[PDB]
Write a protein that binds this ligand. Structure first.
Ligand SMILES: [Ca+2]
Length: 103
């Protein structure tokens, strides 16, 4: 599994982290929307997204920020199948790390 949620009350919620080129890294909140939240939640086996969260709601991550320019229509099987302009982000900081709450 290349996606995990960290820092939440339970495993159904947290900061979104994605594993890419040997490293777990985070997602910037700039373009973070409920369609991407649905993709993340369902790829983790949950029926629905309940909320997306910005501004390191579940604490800041460390390490790379892997995604910022990612656009999901909502029915992709994983965030890696959303439209990703590039991997690796220098225009954000971990204070912007994105989060989700699922089912
Ligand atoms: Ca931001």
């Amino acid at each position: 599994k290349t996606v995990r949620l960290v820092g939440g009350s339970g495993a159904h919620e947290g900061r979104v982290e994605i594993f890419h080129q040997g490293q777990w890294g985070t997602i910037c909140d700039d373009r973070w929307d409920i369609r991407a939240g649905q993709v993340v939640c369902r790829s983790l086996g949950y029926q629905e997204v309940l909320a997306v969260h910005k501004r390191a709601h579940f604490g800041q991550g460390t390490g790379p920020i892997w995604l910022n320019e990612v656009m999901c229509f909502g029915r992709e099987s994983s965030i890696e199948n959303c439209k990703i302009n590039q991997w690796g982000v220098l225009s954000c900081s971990h204070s912007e790390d994105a989060g989700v709450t699922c089912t």
